Short mmCIF file of C-alpha atoms in Angstrom, two decimals:
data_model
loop_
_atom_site.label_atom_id
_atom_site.label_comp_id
_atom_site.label_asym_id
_atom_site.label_seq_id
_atom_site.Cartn_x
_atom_site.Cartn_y
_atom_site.Cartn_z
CA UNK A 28 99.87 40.76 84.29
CA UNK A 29 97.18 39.91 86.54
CA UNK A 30 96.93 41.83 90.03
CA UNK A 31 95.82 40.23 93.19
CA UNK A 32 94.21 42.72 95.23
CA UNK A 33 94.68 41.46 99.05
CA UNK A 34 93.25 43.83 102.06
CA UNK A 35 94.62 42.09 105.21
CA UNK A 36 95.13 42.90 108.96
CA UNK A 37 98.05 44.89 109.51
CA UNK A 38 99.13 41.88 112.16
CA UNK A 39 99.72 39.55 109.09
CA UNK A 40 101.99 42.34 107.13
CA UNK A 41 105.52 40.11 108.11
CA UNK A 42 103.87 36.76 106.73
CA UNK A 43 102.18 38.20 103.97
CA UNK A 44 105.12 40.10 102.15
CA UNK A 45 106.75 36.57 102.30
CA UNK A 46 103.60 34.48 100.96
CA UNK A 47 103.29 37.51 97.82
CA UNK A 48 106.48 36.78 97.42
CA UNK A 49 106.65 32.66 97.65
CA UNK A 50 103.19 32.87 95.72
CA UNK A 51 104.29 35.31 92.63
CA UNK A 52 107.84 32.67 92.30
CA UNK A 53 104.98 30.24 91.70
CA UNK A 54 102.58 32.10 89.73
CA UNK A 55 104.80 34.48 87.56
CA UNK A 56 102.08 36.16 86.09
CA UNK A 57 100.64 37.27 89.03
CA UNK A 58 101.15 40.74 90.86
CA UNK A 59 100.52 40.70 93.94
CA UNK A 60 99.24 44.05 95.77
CA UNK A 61 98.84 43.91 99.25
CA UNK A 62 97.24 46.65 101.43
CA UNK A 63 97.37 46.63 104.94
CA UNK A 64 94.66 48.21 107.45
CA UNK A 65 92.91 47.08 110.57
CA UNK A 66 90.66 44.65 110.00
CA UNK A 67 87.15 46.14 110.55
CA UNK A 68 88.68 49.29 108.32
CA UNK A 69 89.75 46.80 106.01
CA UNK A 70 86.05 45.09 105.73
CA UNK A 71 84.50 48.37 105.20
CA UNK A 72 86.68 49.09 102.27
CA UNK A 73 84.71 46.30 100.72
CA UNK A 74 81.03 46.31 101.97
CA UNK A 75 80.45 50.40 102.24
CA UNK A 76 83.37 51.69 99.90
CA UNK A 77 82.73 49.55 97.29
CA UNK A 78 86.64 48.69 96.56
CA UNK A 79 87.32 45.47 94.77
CA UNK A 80 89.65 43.16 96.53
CA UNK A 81 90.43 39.24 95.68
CA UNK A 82 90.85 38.34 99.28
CA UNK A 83 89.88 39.53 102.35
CA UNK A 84 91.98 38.62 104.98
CA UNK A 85 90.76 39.25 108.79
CA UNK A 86 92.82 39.18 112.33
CA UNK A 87 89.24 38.33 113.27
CA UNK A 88 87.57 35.62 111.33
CA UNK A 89 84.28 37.04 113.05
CA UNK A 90 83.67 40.02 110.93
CA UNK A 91 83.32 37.51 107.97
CA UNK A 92 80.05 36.30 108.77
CA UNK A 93 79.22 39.16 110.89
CA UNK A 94 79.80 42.31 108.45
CA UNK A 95 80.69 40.49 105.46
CA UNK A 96 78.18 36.93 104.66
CA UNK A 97 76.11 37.10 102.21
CA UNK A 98 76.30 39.99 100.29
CA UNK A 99 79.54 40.82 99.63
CA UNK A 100 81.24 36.76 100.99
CA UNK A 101 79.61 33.33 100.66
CA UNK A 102 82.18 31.47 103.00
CA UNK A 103 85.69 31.67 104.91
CA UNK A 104 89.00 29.70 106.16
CA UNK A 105 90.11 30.32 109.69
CA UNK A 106 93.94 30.21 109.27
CA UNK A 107 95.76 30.96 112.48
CA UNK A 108 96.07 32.46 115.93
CA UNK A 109 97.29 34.64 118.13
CA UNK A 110 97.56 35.88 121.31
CA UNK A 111 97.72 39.45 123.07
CA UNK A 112 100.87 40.47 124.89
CA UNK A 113 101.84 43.84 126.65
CA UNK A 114 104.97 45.09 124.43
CA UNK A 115 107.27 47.17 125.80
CA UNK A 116 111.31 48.84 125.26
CA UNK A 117 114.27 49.74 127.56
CA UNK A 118 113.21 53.17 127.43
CA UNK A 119 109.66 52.28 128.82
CA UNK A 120 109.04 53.59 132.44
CA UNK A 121 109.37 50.65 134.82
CA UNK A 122 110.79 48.30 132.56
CA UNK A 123 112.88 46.54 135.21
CA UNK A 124 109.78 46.46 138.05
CA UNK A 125 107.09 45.51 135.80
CA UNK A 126 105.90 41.48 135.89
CA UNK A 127 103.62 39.15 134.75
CA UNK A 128 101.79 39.76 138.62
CA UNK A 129 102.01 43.31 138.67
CA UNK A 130 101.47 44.89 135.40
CA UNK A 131 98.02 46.55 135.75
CA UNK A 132 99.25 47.78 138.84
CA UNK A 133 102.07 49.33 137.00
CA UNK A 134 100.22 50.50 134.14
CA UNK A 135 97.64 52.97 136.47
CA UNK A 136 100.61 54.93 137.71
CA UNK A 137 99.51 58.41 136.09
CA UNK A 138 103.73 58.75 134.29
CA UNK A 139 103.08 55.88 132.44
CA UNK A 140 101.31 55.86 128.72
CA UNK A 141 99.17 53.34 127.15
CA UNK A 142 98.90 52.32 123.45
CA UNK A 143 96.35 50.75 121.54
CA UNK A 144 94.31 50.71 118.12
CA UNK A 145 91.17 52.02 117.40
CA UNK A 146 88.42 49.62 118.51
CA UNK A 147 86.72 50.86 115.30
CA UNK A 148 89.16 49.97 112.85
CA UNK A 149 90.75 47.39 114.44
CA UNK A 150 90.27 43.91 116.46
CA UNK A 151 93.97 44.11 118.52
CA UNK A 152 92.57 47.59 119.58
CA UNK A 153 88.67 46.10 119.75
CA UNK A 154 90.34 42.73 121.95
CA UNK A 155 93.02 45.03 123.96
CA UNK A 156 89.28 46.48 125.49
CA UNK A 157 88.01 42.23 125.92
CA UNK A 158 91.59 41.94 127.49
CA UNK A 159 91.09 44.42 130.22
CA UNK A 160 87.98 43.82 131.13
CA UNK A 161 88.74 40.26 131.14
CA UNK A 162 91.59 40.95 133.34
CA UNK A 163 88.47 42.39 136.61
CA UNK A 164 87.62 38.84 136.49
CA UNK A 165 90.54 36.85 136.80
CA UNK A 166 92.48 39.13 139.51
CA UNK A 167 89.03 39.46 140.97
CA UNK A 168 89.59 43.32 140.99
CA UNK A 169 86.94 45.42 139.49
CA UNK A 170 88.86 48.91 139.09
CA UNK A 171 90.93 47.92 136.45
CA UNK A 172 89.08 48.56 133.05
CA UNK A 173 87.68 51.53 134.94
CA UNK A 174 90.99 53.38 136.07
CA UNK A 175 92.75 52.76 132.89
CA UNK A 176 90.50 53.59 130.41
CA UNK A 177 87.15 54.32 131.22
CA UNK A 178 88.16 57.30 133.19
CA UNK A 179 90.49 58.07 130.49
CA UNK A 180 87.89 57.72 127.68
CA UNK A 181 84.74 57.67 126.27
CA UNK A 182 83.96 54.12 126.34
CA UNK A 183 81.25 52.80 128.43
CA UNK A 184 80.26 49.77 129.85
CA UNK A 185 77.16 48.08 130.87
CA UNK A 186 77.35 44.59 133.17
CA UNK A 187 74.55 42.31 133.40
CA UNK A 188 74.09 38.62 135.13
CA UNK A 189 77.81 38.09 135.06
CA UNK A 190 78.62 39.14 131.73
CA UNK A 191 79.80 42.84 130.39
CA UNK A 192 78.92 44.59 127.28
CA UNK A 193 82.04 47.11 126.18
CA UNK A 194 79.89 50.18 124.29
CA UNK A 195 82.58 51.86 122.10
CA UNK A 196 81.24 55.14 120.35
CA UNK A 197 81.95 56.21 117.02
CA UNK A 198 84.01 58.85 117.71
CA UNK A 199 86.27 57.95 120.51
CA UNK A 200 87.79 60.49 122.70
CA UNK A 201 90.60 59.86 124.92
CA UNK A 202 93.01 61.32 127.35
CA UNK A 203 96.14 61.55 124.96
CA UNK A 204 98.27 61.83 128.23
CA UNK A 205 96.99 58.54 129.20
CA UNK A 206 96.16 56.76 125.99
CA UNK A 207 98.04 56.96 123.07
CA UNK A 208 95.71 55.71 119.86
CA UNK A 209 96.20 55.01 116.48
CA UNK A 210 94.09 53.45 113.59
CA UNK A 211 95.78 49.66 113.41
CA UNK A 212 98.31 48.06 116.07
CA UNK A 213 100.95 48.08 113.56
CA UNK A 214 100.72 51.94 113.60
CA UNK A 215 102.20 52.03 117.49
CA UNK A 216 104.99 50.39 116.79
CA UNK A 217 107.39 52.83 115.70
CA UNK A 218 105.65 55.68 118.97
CA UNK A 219 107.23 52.96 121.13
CA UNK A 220 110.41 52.53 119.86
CA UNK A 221 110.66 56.43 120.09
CA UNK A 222 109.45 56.39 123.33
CA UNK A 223 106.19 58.48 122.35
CA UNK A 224 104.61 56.01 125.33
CA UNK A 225 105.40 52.84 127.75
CA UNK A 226 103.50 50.20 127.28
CA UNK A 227 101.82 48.84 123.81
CA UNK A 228 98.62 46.29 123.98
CA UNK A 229 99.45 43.73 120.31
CA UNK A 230 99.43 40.51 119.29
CA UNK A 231 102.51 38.18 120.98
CA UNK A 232 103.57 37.82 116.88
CA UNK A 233 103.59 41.09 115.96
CA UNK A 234 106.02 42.00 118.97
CA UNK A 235 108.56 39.00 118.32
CA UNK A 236 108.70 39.75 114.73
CA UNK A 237 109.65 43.70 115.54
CA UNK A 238 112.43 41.95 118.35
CA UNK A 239 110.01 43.96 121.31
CA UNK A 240 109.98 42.97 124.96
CA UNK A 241 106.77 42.02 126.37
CA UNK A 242 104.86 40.81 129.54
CA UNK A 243 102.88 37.36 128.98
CA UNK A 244 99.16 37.75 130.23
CA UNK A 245 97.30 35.05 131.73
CA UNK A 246 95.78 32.42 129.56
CA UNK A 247 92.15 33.32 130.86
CA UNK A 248 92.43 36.57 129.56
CA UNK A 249 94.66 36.91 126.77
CA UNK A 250 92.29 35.44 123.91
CA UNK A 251 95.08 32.75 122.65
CA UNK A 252 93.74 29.91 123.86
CA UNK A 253 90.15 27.73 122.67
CA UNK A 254 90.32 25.76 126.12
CA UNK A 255 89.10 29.27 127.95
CA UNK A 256 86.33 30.18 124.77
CA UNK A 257 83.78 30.01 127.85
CA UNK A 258 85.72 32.24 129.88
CA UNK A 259 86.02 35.17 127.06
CA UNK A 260 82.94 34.98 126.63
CA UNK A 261 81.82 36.34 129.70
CA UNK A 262 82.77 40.07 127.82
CA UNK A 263 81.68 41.14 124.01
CA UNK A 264 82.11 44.81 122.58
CA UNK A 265 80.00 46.89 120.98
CA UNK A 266 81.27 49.04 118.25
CA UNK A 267 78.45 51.11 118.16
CA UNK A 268 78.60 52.77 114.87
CA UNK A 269 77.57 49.65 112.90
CA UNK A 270 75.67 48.41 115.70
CA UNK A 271 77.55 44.91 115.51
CA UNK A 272 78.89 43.22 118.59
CA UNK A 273 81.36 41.07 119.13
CA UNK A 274 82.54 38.49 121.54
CA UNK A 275 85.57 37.97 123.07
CA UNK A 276 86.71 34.82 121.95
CA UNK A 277 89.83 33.31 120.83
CA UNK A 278 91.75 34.78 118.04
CA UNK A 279 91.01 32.76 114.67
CA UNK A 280 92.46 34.92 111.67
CA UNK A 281 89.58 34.15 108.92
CA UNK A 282 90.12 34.74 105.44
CA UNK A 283 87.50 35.23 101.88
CA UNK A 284 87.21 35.64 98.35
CA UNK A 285 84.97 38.46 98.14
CA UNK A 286 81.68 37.49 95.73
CA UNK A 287 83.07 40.49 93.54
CA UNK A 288 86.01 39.56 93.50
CA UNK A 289 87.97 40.35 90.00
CA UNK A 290 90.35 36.94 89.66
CA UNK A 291 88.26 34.44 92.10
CA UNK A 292 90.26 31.53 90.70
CA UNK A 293 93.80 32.91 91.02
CA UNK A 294 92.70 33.97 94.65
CA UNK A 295 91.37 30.51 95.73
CA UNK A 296 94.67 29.51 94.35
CA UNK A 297 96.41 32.00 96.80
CA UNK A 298 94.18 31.12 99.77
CA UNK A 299 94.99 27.10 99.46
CA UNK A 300 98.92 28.26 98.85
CA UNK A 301 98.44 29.70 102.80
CA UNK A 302 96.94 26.77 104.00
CA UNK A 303 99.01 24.89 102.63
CA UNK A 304 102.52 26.67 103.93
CA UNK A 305 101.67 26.92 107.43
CA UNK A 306 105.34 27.33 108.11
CA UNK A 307 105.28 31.21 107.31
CA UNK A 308 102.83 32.14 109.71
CA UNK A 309 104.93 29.56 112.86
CA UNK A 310 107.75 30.96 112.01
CA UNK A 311 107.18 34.20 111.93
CA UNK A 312 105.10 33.98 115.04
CA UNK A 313 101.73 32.64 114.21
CA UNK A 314 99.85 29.64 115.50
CA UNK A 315 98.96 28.14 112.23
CA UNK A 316 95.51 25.96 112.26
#
């Protein structure tokens, strides 16, 4: 009884339950165990934790060559997309006034709670920064990032020629009446449902998979789309504890075999089963590339 040992983002929890399950009918002497975390935490389970997993499975294809290549991964797939979204409820303050014009103007009324992940443990929470900051550019209004999380926060950030750097510290300290933070996106889901906070920064497939309301953000700031790659650009975050930084870009979920791995070929065998059943991630959501 073989067990596949698969650390993925805690975005791709909905598909992957159904491609463990689709990929044990197939392989009936294979156990699946999946274990979900952001992807950065999930990274560092394998390079500075030295856990064994058979495939590493990133929201983020970026952290691949970036944290992972060459020690501890030789190469990757980039498997999907996504976009960000602003996910809200009925019981959200402002559901009925809040737009696709207005929503940052909604969102730096001092009543109404944030949520987002850790930039340190997670890319949604890493990108919801990339989002914001993105945002000064395309409404051509630079108090945006400031008034909704820099003055609410430790974060820092430092512009130069046109483009911004987004310095996140290693501990990160925020206003918990403002910003309500969790390790992985996945984690705020069940705060908003209770009503813990209003509005919730995730991935457009995460929210229509959990039935959520949400406000679509402009295409030159939401990180869904290659055609603006030049425009996300313009921003990159550091997370300063590992002293890696990252630019915004568009979302490409990347996925690996780690190079000690325990079962390489049964997970190459489960990484060409996703590419090849693209249909799991679209309908459940996903972009699938």
């Amino acid at each position: 009884k073989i067990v596949l040992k698969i650390f993925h983002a805690g975005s791709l929890s909905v598909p992957f339950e159904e491609y463990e399950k689709m990929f044990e009918k197939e392989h009936p002497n294979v156990d699946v165990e999946r274990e979900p975390a952001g992807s950065v935490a999930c990274v560092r389970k394998i390079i500075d934790l030295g856990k064994k997993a058979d495939i590493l499975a990133s929201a983020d294809y970026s952290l691949i060559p970036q944290m992972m290549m060459p020690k501890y991964a030789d190469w990757y797939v980039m498997f999907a997309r996504n976009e960000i979204v602003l996910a809200y409820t009925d019981k959200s303050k402002y559901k009925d006034e809040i737009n696709s014009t207005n929503w940052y103007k909604i969102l730096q009324r001092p009543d109404v709670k944030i949520g987002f992940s850790n930039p340190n443990d997670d890319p949604c929470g890493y990108r919801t920064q990339m989002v914001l900051q993105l945002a000064e550019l395309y409404y051509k209004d630079p108090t945006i990032y400031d008034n909704l999380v820099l003055k609410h926060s430790n974060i820092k950030v430092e512009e130069n020629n046109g483009t911004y750097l987004i310095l996140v510290p290693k501990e990160l300290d925020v206003d918990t009446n403002k910003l309500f933070v969790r390790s992985k996106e996945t984690d705020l889901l069940a705060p908003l449902e209770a009503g813990a906070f209003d509005y919730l920064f995730i991935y457009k497939s995460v929210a229509n998979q959990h039935h959520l309301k949400y406000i679509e953000l402009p295409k030159e700031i939401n990180l869904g789309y290659y055609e603006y790659a030049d425009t996300y650009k313009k921003v990159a975050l550091k997370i300063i504890a590992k002293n890696k930084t990252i630019n915004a870009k568009p979302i490409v979920y990347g996925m690996t075999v780690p190079t000690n791995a325990p079962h390489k070929k049964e997970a190459i065998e489960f990484v060409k089963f996703v590419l090849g059943h693209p249909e799991v991630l679209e309908n459940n959501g996903q972009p699938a590339i």
